[PDB]
Amino acid sequence: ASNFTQFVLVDNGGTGDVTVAPSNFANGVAEWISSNSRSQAYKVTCSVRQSSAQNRKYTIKVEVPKVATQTVGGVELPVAAWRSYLNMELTIPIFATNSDCELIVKAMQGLLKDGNPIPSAIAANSGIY
Amino acid sequence: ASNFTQFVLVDNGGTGDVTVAPSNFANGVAEWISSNSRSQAYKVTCSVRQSSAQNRKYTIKVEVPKVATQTVGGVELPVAAWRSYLNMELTIPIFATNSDCELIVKAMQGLLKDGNPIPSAIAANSGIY
Amino acid sequence: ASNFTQFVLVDNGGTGDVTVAPSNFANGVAEWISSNSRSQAYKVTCSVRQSSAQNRKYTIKVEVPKVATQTVGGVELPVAAWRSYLNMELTIPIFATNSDCELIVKAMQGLLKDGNPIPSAIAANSGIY
Amino acid sequence: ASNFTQFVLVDNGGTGDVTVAPSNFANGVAEWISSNSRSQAYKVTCSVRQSSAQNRKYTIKVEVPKVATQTVGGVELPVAAWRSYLNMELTIPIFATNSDCELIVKAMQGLLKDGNPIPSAIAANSGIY
Amino acid sequence: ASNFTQFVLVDNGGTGDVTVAPSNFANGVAEWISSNSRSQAYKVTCSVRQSSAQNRKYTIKVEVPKVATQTVGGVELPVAAWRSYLNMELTIPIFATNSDCELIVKAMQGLLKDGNPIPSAIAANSGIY
Amino acid sequence: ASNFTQFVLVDNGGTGDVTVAPSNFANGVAEWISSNSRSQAYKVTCSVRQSSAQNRKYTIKVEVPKVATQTVGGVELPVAAWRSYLNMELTIPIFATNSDCELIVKAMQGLLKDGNPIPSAIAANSGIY
């Protein structure tokens, strides 16, 4: 069941979607990027390992470009002003079954579902109030 | 209106859904828990801070328990056999607009969407290949 | 093309086969893991290195679990009651051609072929008699 | 009955097979040797012992020669230009039944089956890619 | 689709072409080798890394052998009389777009094109004058 | 057989080609540049020397400008953000004949030919996957 394929990272109803495609598999770490320069592209990486005696850990990283007023193909500096970073670590005990892992995935999806508090706060440049 | 509201963490289609409700805001950490004992409850936390002069950082954590009943000294107690921990750190430059932040939210949602590589690998107890 | 793919480790006809899938390639050691709980999964690893100026060495390891349920204090967990460990080291001189390597592989396959003395002894909990 | 018998180590169809025959059983180590000159012969050894209170350990070794003629000072001798060495160690707990042992053997056979990643890498003078 | 595929390293017009095929990806170094013994094979390697915060570096190496048969201790062995080594280091800023990278590739191709000064000098065992 | 002449570094089908012409021969090092400012020009250099007792080494360097969003004739800073560098070293044993050197040139051409893995990865801002 090979799964290292391109997917839609940002869905805009079919027009203007952001697709990321496989770009690197060095050291077993899967990497996806959008069709941009490295400084302006969406980037996804994912790897999993045995973190401890009784846990496995997925390490998932995402880079998102700032798009308002950007210059496509231009040199934008400083780098830290134009990019957002997501660092996500999922620790799962070795006892978890496929059913348990499906539940964990549902928890993450529900956490980030549109209309829920956490995505609402992020989208509104706000905290919890 | 306040964004500190209850939400469905695990959507099972209306029956057996896991709901978490606001439970604490002490020390600037927003907390949600399911309607269980503290030993067996699901848990969600979220905080935001000015990590540096030009970036803001969200710190989001989720705990998924595997519930069980443990006999301690001849008495049965509600415990969690183990817990799965999700840790998300999201750094956003102060220059990001609301539309830029909406892109970040859509990227995360698309990352975890059903059928996409990363959730499929997690649900299947496997890496990406 | 790529040989870091899913494969059938235990061929139980067509139904009930044990399949292992790539999970990790850290430090140049490829790792395959079967699905469901990691505590009960099969494990295969393989690495190759230049052991001397004239020799290359393959290191291959396989773990076969005995699946069981552990119950301690009323808490049930899926575990391996015990595991069987295979450690293989194969040294091949740099002078060997593709034809020579194919012959070496045939030797290993013939060593473990059904009806032959060594697989028969292993399958019968027996030595050589 | 007896498993200390002649067997086909390399199966080259029906003509040109490499057959090894019992030669020695000293110190509880069974040894098979192919025919013709010993300097060029294939070698297989196998022994089993109680490695710990709960484990039995098989030690299996195979030598594959590259046949050649050595000429020193006009004197010709049949030799092996070099040899490939396989060393296998298999540990099986005393609790394993005959069914469990048959499963372990199937795992080894499936590991080395044609088309699978590890035999393919060996036959192609290659690693995992 | 994966870009880790076999390719014709030396094009002789369809007869006598030298083909290299994927052979290893351990430690993040992609390797190709020809269908020969390791002592006589052609070799290609390629890796990419973030050399600094704003540049990426490709490291590409090729080995071209001059094959021969060497008598060592009265036994003939396949060796390389000597090897020619090509080492390429290519540094690209993160701000380069795909079109910018295509220009880099075209520049290298035009540099080595038949009839151009540098390949002519190399083929003629001479410098540029 | 003088060979220090202008050549087409980037071929765009006859219209828009990038030609580089001789611009310096100090210290015996041949240099070509395009018709631009030094900060925005294509630049090629080549020299050859006796690197060791049994090897000669060609040192070939190429500089390629970033063209997307450039400003022709403008001051573009920092320099490292607008230019890509190729450093290529070809080591050839003194025993190699003209025929051997022609084969080496073919190897380089095949390495960089359109549609092959290495140029494909570079053009797509990607590694090997």
Swiss-Prot record, chains A, B, C, D, E, F:
Gene3D superfamilies: MS2 Viral Coat Protein. Keywords: Capsid protein, RNA-binding, T=3 icosahedral capsid protein, Translation regulation, Virion. Changing E76A: No effect on the organization of the T=3 capsid, but with a loss of thermal stability. No effect on infectivity. Changing P78A: No effect on the organization of the T=3 capsid, but with a loss of thermal stability. Complete loss of infectivity. GO terms for cellular component: T=3 icosahedral viral capsid. One of its GO terms (molecular function) is RNA binding. InterPro entries: Levivir_coat, Phage_RNA-type_capsid. The keyword Transit peptide does not apply. Residues 31-104 are annotated as: Viral RNA-binding. Signal peptide: none annotated. It is found in: Virion. One of its GO terms (biological process) is regulation of translation. Belongs to the Leviviricetes capsid protein family. Capsid protein self-assembles to form an icosahedral capsid with a T=3 symmetry, about 26 nm in diameter, and consisting of 89 capsid proteins dimers (178 capsid proteins). Involved in viral genome encapsidation through the interaction between a capsid protein dimer and the multiple packaging signals present in the RNA genome. The capsid also contains 1 copy of the A2 maturation protein. Homodimer. The capsid proteins form dimers that assemble by group of 5. Twelve such pentamers are linked together with free dimers. The homodimers binds to the viral RNA via an operator hairpin, but also to many other RNA sequences in the viral genome; this interaction probably shifts the virus from the replicative to the assembly phase and ensures specific encapsidation of the viral genome. This is Capsid protein. It comes from Escherichia phage MS2.
